[PDB]
Amino acid sequence: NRDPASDQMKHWKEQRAAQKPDVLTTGGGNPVGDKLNSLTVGPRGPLLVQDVVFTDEMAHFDRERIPERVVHAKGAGAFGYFEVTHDITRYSKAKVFEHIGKRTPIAVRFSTVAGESGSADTVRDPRGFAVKFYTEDGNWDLVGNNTPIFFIRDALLFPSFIHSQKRNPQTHLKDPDMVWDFWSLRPESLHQVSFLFSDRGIPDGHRHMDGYGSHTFKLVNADGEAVYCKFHYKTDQGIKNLSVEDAARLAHEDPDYGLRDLFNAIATGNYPSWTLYIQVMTFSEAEIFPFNPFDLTKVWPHGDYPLIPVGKLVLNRNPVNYFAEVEQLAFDPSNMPPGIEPSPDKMLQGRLFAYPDTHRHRLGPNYLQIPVNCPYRARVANYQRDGPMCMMDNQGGAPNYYPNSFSAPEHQPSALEHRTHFSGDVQRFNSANDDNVTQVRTFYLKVLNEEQRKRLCENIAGHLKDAQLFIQKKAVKNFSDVHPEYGSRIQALLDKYN
Amino acid sequence: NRDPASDQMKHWKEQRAAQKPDVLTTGGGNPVGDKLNSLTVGPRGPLLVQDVVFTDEMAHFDRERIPERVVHAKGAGAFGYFEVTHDITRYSKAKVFEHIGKRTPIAVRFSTVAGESGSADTVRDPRGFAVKFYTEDGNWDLVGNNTPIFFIRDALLFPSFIHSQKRNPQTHLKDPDMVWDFWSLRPESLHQVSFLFSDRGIPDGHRHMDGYGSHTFKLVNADGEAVYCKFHYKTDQGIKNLSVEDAARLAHEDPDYGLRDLFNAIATGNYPSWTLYIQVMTFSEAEIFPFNPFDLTKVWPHGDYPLIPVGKLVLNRNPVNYFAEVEQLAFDPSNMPPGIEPSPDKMLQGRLFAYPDTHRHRLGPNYLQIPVNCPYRARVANYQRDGPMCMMDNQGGAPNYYPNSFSAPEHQPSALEHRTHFSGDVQRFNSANDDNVTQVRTFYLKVLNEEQRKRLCENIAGHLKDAQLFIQKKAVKNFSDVHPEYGSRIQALLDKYN
Amino acid sequence: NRDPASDQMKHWKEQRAAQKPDVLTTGGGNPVGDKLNSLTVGPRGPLLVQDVVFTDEMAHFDRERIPERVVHAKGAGAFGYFEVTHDITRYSKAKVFEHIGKRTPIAVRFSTVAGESGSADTVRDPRGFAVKFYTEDGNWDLVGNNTPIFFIRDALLFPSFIHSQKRNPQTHLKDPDMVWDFWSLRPESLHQVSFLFSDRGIPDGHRHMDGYGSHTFKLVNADGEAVYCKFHYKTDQGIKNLSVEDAARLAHEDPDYGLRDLFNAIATGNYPSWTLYIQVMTFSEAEIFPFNPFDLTKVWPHGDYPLIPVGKLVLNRNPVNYFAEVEQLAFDPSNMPPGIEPSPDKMLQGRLFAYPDTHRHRLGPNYLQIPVNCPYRARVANYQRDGPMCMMDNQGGAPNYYPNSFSAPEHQPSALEHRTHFSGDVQRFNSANDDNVTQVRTFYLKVLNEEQRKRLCENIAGHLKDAQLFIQKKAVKNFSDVHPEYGSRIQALLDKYN
Amino acid sequence: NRDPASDQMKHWKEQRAAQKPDVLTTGGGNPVGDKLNSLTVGPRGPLLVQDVVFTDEMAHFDRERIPERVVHAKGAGAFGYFEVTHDITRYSKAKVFEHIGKRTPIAVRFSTVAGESGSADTVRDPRGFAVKFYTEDGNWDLVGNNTPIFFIRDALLFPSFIHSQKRNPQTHLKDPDMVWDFWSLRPESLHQVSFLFSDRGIPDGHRHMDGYGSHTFKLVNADGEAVYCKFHYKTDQGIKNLSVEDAARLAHEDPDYGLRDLFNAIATGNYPSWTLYIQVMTFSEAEIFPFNPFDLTKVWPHGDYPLIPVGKLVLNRNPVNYFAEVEQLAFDPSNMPPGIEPSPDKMLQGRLFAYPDTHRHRLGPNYLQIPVNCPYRARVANYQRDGPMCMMDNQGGAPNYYPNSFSAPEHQPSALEHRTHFSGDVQRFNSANDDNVTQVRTFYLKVLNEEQRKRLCENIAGHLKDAQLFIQKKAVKNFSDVHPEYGSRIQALLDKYN
Numbered sequence A, B, C, D: 001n002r003d004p005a006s007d008q009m010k011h012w013k014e015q016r017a018a019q020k021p022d023v024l025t026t027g028g029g030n031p032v033g034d035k036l037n038s039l040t041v042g043p044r045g046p047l048l049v050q051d052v053v054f055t056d057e058m059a060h061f062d063r064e065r066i067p068e069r070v071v072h073a074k075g076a077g078a079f080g081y082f083e084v085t086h087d088i089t090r091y092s093k094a095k096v097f098e099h100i101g102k103r104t105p106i107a108v109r110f111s112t113v114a115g116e117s118g119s120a121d122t123v124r125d126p127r128g129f130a131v132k133f134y135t136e137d138g139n140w141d142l143v144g145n146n147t148p149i150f151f152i153r154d155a156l157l158f159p160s161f162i163h164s165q166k167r168n169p170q171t172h173l174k175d176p177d178m179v180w181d182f183w184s185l186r187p188e189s190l191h192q193v194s195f196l197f198s199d200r201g202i203p204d205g206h207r208h209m210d211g212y213g214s215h216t217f218k219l220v221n222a223d224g225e226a227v228y229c230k231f232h233y234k235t236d237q238g239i240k241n242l243s244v245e246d247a248a249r250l251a252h253e254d255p256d257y258g259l260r261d262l263f264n265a266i267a268t269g270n271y272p273s274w275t276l277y278i279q280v281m282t283f284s285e286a287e288i289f290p291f292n293p294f295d296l297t298k299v300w301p302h303g304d305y306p307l308i309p310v311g312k313l314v315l316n317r318n319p320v321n322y323f324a325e326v327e328q329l330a331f332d333p334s335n336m337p338p339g340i341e342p343s344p345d346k347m348l349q350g351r352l353f354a355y356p357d358t359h360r361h362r363l364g365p366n367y368l369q370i371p372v373n374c375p376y377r378a379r380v381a382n383y384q385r386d387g388p389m390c391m392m393d394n395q396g397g398a399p400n401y402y403p404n405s406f407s408a409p410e411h412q413p414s415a416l417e418h419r420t421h422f423s424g425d426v427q428r429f430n431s432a433n434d435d436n437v438t439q440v441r442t443f444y445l446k447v448l449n450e451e452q453r454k455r456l457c458e459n460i461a462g463h464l465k466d467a468q469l470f471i472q473k474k475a476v477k478n479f480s481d482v483h484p485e486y487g488s489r490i491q492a493l494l495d496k497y498n
Ligand code: HEM
Pocket: A062, D068, D069, D070, D071, D072, D075, D109, D110, D111, D127, D128, D129, D130, D143, D144, D145, D150, D154, D155, D156, D158, D212, D213, D214, D215, D329, D330, D331, D347, D348, D350, D351, D354, D355, D358, D359, D362
């Protein structure tokens, strides 16, 4: 015997030992007489159009591939449940939270960011940690990361940021000039760059890292009272990281280390779990916060805003077909049931648009009809119709305009959004010159210890040394702005590379 | 009360009188608070990206339309059954025929040819009569027409023929120069042009016309003995046609006359039926036939090849959602179960390719997973995987290569194609100068009577008069080649138009 | 000789009188030996896969069709120029207006609304009148209609409204219950319904109707001073309408009457023109307007806001290929150069999203690279890359992230949008019960004469007669709310139908 | 200074040293005032739909990705010329060969087979070596590999074979059970498996490997005399391979080693070249060949069929934009000019269908209009029209049906394919049990030396060790069938792994 992942086919056969293999058919259900030899006129004669077995199979093979995710292309999935353990009904009326012990099925997808479908799991990169809750009030997608923060605080910078990470448009190589030119010109990135080049930049698989919603969200209770919140889901397996040496080895030795580790853990009954927490910030406290509390480069200090337990996320089922159940998984931040709403975070506001938009491209207009995407715990009833690959009854003969006198679906006032007041000029407000260094200094000096600071500066120097000197100089000036010794440490390492 | 079609919504509501309307949701299953008013900052303020109710609905509205059929875009559908009444098991082992009284569910789509989705039902044109049989051995699509013959006998002419019927590439108008230049240069078209401009060119709805497979097909019995066949399905309601005057009136008065007539007939229990017949031609008789028995411009004379009854086609169910169940219907001539095979008919050989190819474009790579297209009476099991909008389990964890040692699906030798011998040069053989006039003369002189001949020549002159004189002259020469008086009749009518 | 449109092929032939027809090739540029006869093994043998001439041609034929526009599917196009005749530079700094005599190339598409690509030109429906200005500051799309108003004033009603105007989802038939249920429940539609059932409901082709921007827009001058405006383009050929009897006859006699009329006018040098006017309203005037000045169901009365001449629209060029140049035309209201900006009109805000969104579906991600859609009179330079059917150099090796230190394109502060102040709650504010009757009363009593009132009420009664009595009753109540005699006139006509 | 590839941005900047960077615009050509800050109501307010700069950019970003190639996803491209050096006009009339010194522009793409777009260059796998010749008789695509043979000889095994080489459908991991189960069941793979696990399994970049057409093709001269041929293009830089240890290190150290090496060679003027040879075999020689001369698992021995020089392939131009020029490159084996034709090779016949088919999916219906795919050195003239993303005049107002009387393009009889005779039954003829061992014995014993045999058996044992024992046993039996010591060598290595 090997690992469970290695014995996938052996176990499939054993489960089906007395199955009596199925008859091999065309897509049209016609049985096939011989799928090993093409139809020709004589043994050394030409192939015929009449070989509809060959073209049925080859035309489908020719169409197997769909566009990979524009980002987080490389990933691993599992299914399980969310279990409420504690009462947050004073903050949120959302059905998902409504009583202790209540279970909601989830889907989870873990990923890297920059690498395309064939890249390695054990590389330095943020990790996607996306959770789909199939609630009675529809799907709630909490599209999280293994960091509470990000590199930028306006969505207009996002395409550029990703371009700067991904391949040179001429050469198709990774380009340290592109990476550090962008980061040196945009020092709001200093906080997450500091997280990224620390030890938690290369987690030991998906089970040994935390998840965060990252953004400020809004919770609304049964009285229509709102608070702002952050979602934290902490690993029950504990934080564990790979050394740059071990990460490098696994990169060529098992590019799919993360996939394999998650599958085997679930197959052997070593089910991974996380505790979901919220931080709560009053509208009054949001006015007094010394930063923009909607700035994605900032955390809420735990001292001032302690973690409040909510429940348990448990992954206890592997995918049966990876393409159907994982590759086709679509998470939309805009999928929020009553009791959960967006904040004015400029990055989050951008995501409300981007995810359903890319899903209509990558998957198709009717992507929400793919079974893993279906809000299967809710009754979908509305005035939407048709589109390519329309899958179910398309809501039959139901009146397709609103309003109508013919008893078709009706809106539900209790689901109305929470009323928040705004005043100001309609303008592109500059956010570039908000505090870029303060929280990063507390991380560098207080959170990490000496050996972590040393590895951090070695990790950055190791990559930054490949950029031109003028980029190296601008970068070091940013690290110096957080703390003189953070800068001078990097600069000394840079000096003996150059 | 009105007609049943007119009371569609009234009956939907009455059926749902005590329904308790559904809650209106987003595609993601989230309930909607107010779907009549957009989210703005103040009553006369700008629209927000945060209005995910608006963009969910509008993005789907923006994607409602799919490409219309390249031909037969305008159509009507119904469902019912095929019932075997007579034994043809000496000719075909196909499960669909296997015992008297055996029922197979069918889908039917009726159509015009040239008109796009918004065109009129009661125009002069051939009619599509496509029948999908959901058999235990997969789907059998008999993609028929209301004529036993066609305009051409090689598929290389088909795109040109259709272009010549459809709009001028600059003007976007119907173009009599294009119509008659093609037909005058390709006199193999004389037979079906003669059928088309007769009274049966404008049927009174879909229920008062016959269906034909048109092509020669092959039937194979349980002994591996083959014969050639033709499929005929004759209306139990009787042949009935609209006068050019009545067809013209209904064109602006009810462009959807055919849709309305079929729906109302089924809704009132006036279920339309056809008797399915075969003609049988031995391989020996195929050698002695005075024409190419695979030439789509030719019939098998009933005298020499009498109709052999098979069973009954009955339409007893309307579509519930037209887009899902009709617009998305996909018929592939290549869908043939064991016991039914193609002939060497050059036109049919072309269709084996064209239909699955256009369906992968119009509908999508996984179009056979659309419920109305599913071979739902067969177990589909094979080595095909993935592709866009992959709908079911994608055959789970089943071994995805053949051959394999892991008990995945196996081919079934009894399904092997019938062995036929061919000898010759691989060449583009000229079929243009086969007999173009003989069977057309017997139609003009023997099948039609005097008043039918007169209307026929009036119908042609009425349209041909708009072509340039040199086209008129070439056309008349072809009609003269079938019979001098067929030509001179047209030419006299032409003379007093010009 | 016939009309110029009829002689399209004749003229094309003559114009290459030197001849030497081109060599017939595959898409790959390989010359074709015989495209009239398929490659078979012997003359009555099977078709070979080796016939790559057949597959190349048939596969392209199989893919000819793209989704038709979700609305305004049925249309006519022509090209020409815009010429400035008056100085409006005190209102708008837009380069398009910057000096008298300045010419800008334009593209124009005329259409109906509800009908599909095969429907008739001469039906009762609003008419699209979309104008693309190819300016030095990029494309300006003025996506106008032959009416200054519309049926609804919130984009969330738009898909519903269009659903109600198109086919029953089960029957696929036009449904007077759907039409009048929606209109009777939404009496904001009374104004444009009154415009629609008046004489200007069926214009005599596209040359004899006016165009309107319809929406309030914003004009911004070189001093950053803003005003609100409305665009009017009045026909220089004069208003002319078809009687319902004449329109009905042309429906079946020439479904493409509009296409034919526009092509022939331009072909014979009878170039149609329009005079472009603006109305101007101050921010202060907007605060005092007795209605919402951004409500699409209202006009600015000419007495209070007189037309200000700007310039001339001239169509002097027919399309050469209709699919490439017209079917593929894409107008985005969001295409606005500096000097022209959106107003808070709920409907316009909706359209800023919908058109680029539907274009990415109907045409493709890179639709703006289709030559007729290309802003060919501007330099397109940005950080956008790749996508399906990327057709130009994809901006070559240019740095693909912003900001950068490598000389890639730079934002231009003079292009910054005009700053306006807003205060309010984020809420769905109800606009259903704004004034629905006042301006409609003045239209019925002042603008129309007796004979026009009578035809108006006949035109409504003639359609509304087929709706259920409860819908007839509610509709009549709304017409009664505008004026008792408008209601009683319709009710008397209805009474002798029922 | 670094390598030229590293300095791509630096060089781009310098080359426009005059500066005046372009104005940043939307896709619509509208200039952008600030693309760094989103449009909000106040600085901590919500994002507006009015921010059409954000939506234009983000919607294009959302649509960057297209499906990767179903095989050979990971690749490098360059451009140059083909120069004729010898007269082969006695064998082929193809314009490409017609006189010595004649130059043809070429495009070339190198690739691995199984890996996705993010996988490493320096892995064991065959290498694609595809060459596009832009000839006056259209494009000639010679879609070759770095091997003269392949693993299978019938196209019906191809999707299965590729499935077996890629990821487990449940696990998404490489699966040695899938690899060796398929290879052990299909011993026709022994020859190319022997080539693959030899030293030439991991070439030192793309410049140090040979190209082969692999298939038997047909050459036809001006007299209509045909011969069978094989194309060989031998590296002028010499064969050079990476050790498994070195290839392993470069896998994680530079996953893009191949891309980097080709770009740098061309950038520094070290242009790589290949010498094109043919082998020629008579129709009479084909009848006497001791194997099937069309069997893709066999070579023509050089002793019996010596290489005949033809000309020189030179790569002297790097891509400027990789997505536009390389990712979008499409090679169709069916692109063959007069003088070059397919043989009855079952595998080649399969490829005549598969490539245009996958290109219509991956790229679009009109992929041949993508500039790098355009047969720009030929006039494309035919009766093909329309389709999505139609980019040129769509052949303007040219008559669109054939035949026509209006001077549209004409077929050219000199282009007619060569006529060959076939006799036989239409059947699926078994090719599984053709000689699987003879030529592989000569390769193992004659072509390789002792040290090479030892590395070969180490390379196989090193992979096969992870397959189940029953698969190990069947594989060893096949290697034993070629020579007992080939088998026992592998079995000894296997024994000390197990
Ligand atoms: C029946 C056998 C085969 C089938 C069905 C087949 C099919 C395919 C398909 C579908 C692609 C993807 C093409 C694209 O997306 O652009 C591909 C790529 C490729 N195939 Fe094959 N293939 C076969 C055999 C071979 C053989 C025998 C060779 C070489 C002798 C070969 C060389 C290639 C190359 C080089 C590419 C990549 C071309 C590029 O760089 O764009 N294939 N093949």
